[PDB]
Design a protein around this ligand. Structure first.
Ligand SMILES: CCCC[C@H](CC(O)(O)[C@H](CCCC)NC(=O)[C@@H](NC(=O)[C@@H](NC(C)=O)[C@@H](C)O)[C@@H](C)CC)C(=O)N[C@@H](CCC(N)=O)C(=O)N[C@@H](CCCNC(=N)N)C(N)=O
Lengths: 99, 99
């Protein structure tokens, strides 16, 4: 699909058998979702935003469905105001910015 | 142009007669530029995201050239780590997210 930006580009994702809302975020290097239970061991990572840095838990090779497209990659878990799908997974679904 | 997301989608912009590099960010409601001088009166505003909130100055009716495309809208000025072009101006250049 082609998505205009008059409204926030929110989509439905499926992770860990749950449906959650997420923002398609070209301004994010990585993908971050709010606190949830994910399988496997995690590693520590620090990420920065407009207001500074936060500590998140990094999980690898997580299966996640984004607006119907399956992706398998790195997901960070932490205190983010909203679930964000970043470039790491956007490239997997073949997303591009056009104008 | 069609912009892939293997890398950060940065583009050249022209504001206040100055050339700057900016990030095309579908995850940003507004446009935030690094500390610089702009004409007119402004209002204080607080914007947030990952890491918390920061204080910016809001200037309205500012003309900005985004990668060649002239647009007009509100521009926030503050201590941002990177110049961000949000949806308020992305819509004006007809930018879309395709996948
Ligand atoms: C420095 C600012 C870079 C811009 C983006 C912003 C954004 O991710 O698009 C987020 C996503 C939405 C909320 C989480 N948008 C925002 O943060 C924007 N917020 C908003 O639009 C709304 N705010 C809220 C809280 O809803 C609006 C209501 O104000 C603001 C820019 C203000 C309009 C951002 O935070 N990117 C992080 C995402 C986290 C991540 N790791 O992917 C990033 O890539 N950080 C990189 C490097 C960033 C560049 N380097 C640096 N010097 N910090 C990193 N690896 O840590």
């Amino acid at each position: 699909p082609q998505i205009t930006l008059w409204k926030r580009p929110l989509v439905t994702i499926k992770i860990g058998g749950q449906l959650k809302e997420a923002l398609l975020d070209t301004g994010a290097d990585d993908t971050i979702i709010e606190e949830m239970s994910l399988p496997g061991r995690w590693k520590p990572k620090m990420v920065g935003g407009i207001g500074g840095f936060i500590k998140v838990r990094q999980y690898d090779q997580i299966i996640i469905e984004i607006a119907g497209h399956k992706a398998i990659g790195t997901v960070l878990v932490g205190p983010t105001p909203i679930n964000i799908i970043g470039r790491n997974l956007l490239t997997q679904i073949g997303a591009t910015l056009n104008f």
